[PDB]
């Protein structure tokens, strides 16, 4: 494909019921991402306390819906970055269940 976000937002079913307005894909190993749940505890954007920030910078891609994008013909702008991720963790085992932010 010629647009990573267009391809991935579609194949991961993120354009099925609507165009998900924003989404981040993380390119690190599952183990490295799961490990973040034991790293820096920070407040979640929603005020909950179960968010964790990665000590290391991680390779990520941000996907953001374009202005002309209109469901069901979704369209995205792709932006690559290397940033610390912030994820919300829950459960036993304690694992990532939401992507909160990158910083």
């Amino acid at each position: 494909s010629s647009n990573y976000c267009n391809q991935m937002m579609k194949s991961r079913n993120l354009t099925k019921d609507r165009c998900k307005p924003v989404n981040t894909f993380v390119h690190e190993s599952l183990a490295d991402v799961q490990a973040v749940c034991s790293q820096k505890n920070v407040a979640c954007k929603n005020g909950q306390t179960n968010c964790y920030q990665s000590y290391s910078t991680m390779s990520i891609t941000d996907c953001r819906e374009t202005g002309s994008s209109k469901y069901p013909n979704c369209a995205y702008k792709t932006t690559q970055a290397n940033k610390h991720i912030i994820v919300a963790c829950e459960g036993n085992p304690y694992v990532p269940v939401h992507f909160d932010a990158s910083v």
Binding site: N23, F25, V26, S29, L30, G91, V95, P96, V97, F99
Partner: peptide, 15 residues
């Protein structure tokens, strides 16, 4: 069916 952990992986993981 899909667990919260599996949904996170589908939405956010691309190794």
């Amino acid at each position: 069916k899909e667990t919260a952990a599996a949904k996170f992986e589908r939405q956010h993981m691309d190794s």
